[PDB]
Write a protein that binds this ligand. Structure first.
Ligand code: HEM
Length: 446
């Protein structure tokens, strides 16, 4: 069974602090680094057990993950069982129809050896922890890049930068989570390496870890808002209400969290707020042909592209359990400043903001990489539809900088096509392995 005392907390619980820092480092002296990894990092790594208890949240929650080159630097030559992780995200960029020439330069390579995730309710406490780490490790650790992130303010807390409530939908791990209505239920080994029904044999010290896909995804918020107004479907409501409908058609949920599949023509903010109801759907509706009906939710909507539910078979009534092996745990957090008055008034981004994307899975080829390449970026996914060309995911779908053709968004005519500029721009990232806590002061410090 699942040993949550040994699993790093961000994987299954999230840090649930107002502020986070992603501190990307190189290891310069493995002997000194190992000594301090065991003495200074391991004792303050937050576990799932610790973060699951309202009364044991630390002042600074800390997790740590290593890239392939970081494990090599530590003398760990084992095969962790993941070719994508071993090769690094830069080499995978073409799989997503993007180029590393657009990336943060530090990500366009394999010089990054790991990431420390620090989380606290204030940045001052994060900075103090960083200063301590740099003091005790000396030059054996070196900062190559960092990204600060924060929960958004006020009534946008928990929403991403486009304004949509985020963090609603996650896989439930059988035997660990109590499933919510409509939630997929998966074996622990989909997320945790070496856990139940992970088919890939792992090094013994790596049991209890997970692969972390980090993505710095810039969001063009004023441009997105203006696009919705400019393309809003005709109807009797206000222009902004119709623009909001188009945005909800693109995501698959209203900004409140209400799923369009259950409320297709107007928001239901009470539904969006209710975790017992807001995920209780499969995309099937009796009396409608699943292969052609886009009146409830477009086939191209973001959440339908990333968790297809009945589009990949299984139960037509909730819970649908299809494609459990393609599940990911998400712990992303927004970054950058809030949109300023001048940016909104000019419909133009002038500062970088977006999502610090964090996806956890036991197999990169089945999780993040698969969702991006085989589903979101695939104009013929989901399969078996009419028209067969679904188009790309309007939120994350990529085609080498081209405008994306996205079909089915307009309720009055499912054959109507839109050519949509990117509103999310990748600045790159890296693939890491978040080890079990025992490996931090154990194998990795040996
Ligand atoms: C800036 C980029 C992104 C934005 C703005 C975004 C936004 C959202 C929103 C608003 C939701 C609905 C809330 C929820 O169901 O929890 C969602 C769900 C989801 N997103 Fe994205 N997301 C982004 C990137 C990604 C990427 C890169 C992936 C994977 C390749 C991804 C995978 C998912 C999944 C799996 C779900 C849950 C689907 C379900 O279980 O029904 N997202 N996202």
């Amino acid at each position: 069974s699942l040993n949550t005392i040994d699993i790093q907390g961000d994987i299954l619980v999230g840090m649930h602090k107002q502020k986070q820092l992603f501190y990307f480092f190189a290891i310069n002296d493995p002997a000194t680094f190992k000594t301090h990894l065991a003495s200074d990092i391991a004792p303050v790594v937050a576990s799932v057990t610790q973060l699951s208890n309202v009364a044991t949240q630390p002042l600074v929650a800390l997790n740590i993950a290593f890239s392939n080159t970081g494990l090599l630097a530590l003398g760990v030559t084992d095969n962790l069982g993941d070719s994508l992780f071993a090769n690094g995200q830069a080499k995978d960029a073409t799989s997503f129809k993007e180029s590393t020439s657009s990336w943060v330069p530090q990500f366009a390579g394999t010089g990054i050896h790991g990431v420390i995730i620090l989380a606290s309710d204030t940045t001052d406490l994060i900075d103090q922890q960083v200063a301590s780490i740099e003091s005790t490790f000396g030059s054996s650790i070196s900062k190559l890049y960092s990204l600060s992130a924060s929960i958004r303010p006020g009534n946008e807390a928990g929403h991403e930068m486009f304004g949509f409530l985020d963090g609603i939908a996650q896989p439930a791990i059988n035997g660990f989570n109590t499933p919510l209505p409509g939630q997929n239920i998966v074996d622990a080994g989909v997320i945790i390496t070496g856990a139940t029904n992970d088919p890939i044999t792992r090094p013994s010290w790596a049991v209890g870890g997970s692969f972390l896909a980090f993505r710095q995804l810039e969001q063009l918020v004023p441009e997105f808002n203006k696009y919705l107004l400019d393309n809003a479907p005709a109807g009797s409501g206000s222009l902004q209400a119709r623009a909001d409908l188009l945005g909800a058609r693109m995501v698959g949920r209203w900004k409140s969290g209400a799923p369009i599949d259950l409320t297709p023509t107007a928001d239901d903010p009470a539904l969006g707020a209710d975790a017992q109801r807001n995920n209780n759907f499969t995309y099937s509706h009796a009396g409608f042909d699943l292969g052609s009906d886009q009146s409830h939710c477009p086939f191209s909507a973001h959440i339908r592209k990333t968790r297809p539910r009945a589009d990949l078979g299984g139960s037509l009534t909730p819970p649908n359990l299809s494609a459990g092996a393609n599940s990911i745990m998400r712990s992303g957090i927004p970054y950058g400043p809030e949109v300023t008055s001048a940016e909104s008034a000019s419909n133009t981004t002038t500062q970088e903001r977006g999502l610090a994307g964090v996806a956890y899975q036991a197999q990169l080829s089945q999780g993040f990489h698969f969702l991006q390449q085989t589903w979101a970026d695939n104009a013929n996914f989901p399969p078996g539809k009419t028209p067969a060309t679904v188009g790309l995911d309007p939120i994350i779908g990529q085609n080498n900088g081209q405008p994306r053709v996205v079909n089915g968004l307009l309720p009055s005519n499912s054959s109507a096509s839109l050519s949509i500029p990117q509103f999310v721009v990748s600045h790159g990232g890296e693939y890491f392995f978040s080890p079990p806590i025992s490996a931090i002061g154990g194998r990795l410090s040996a």
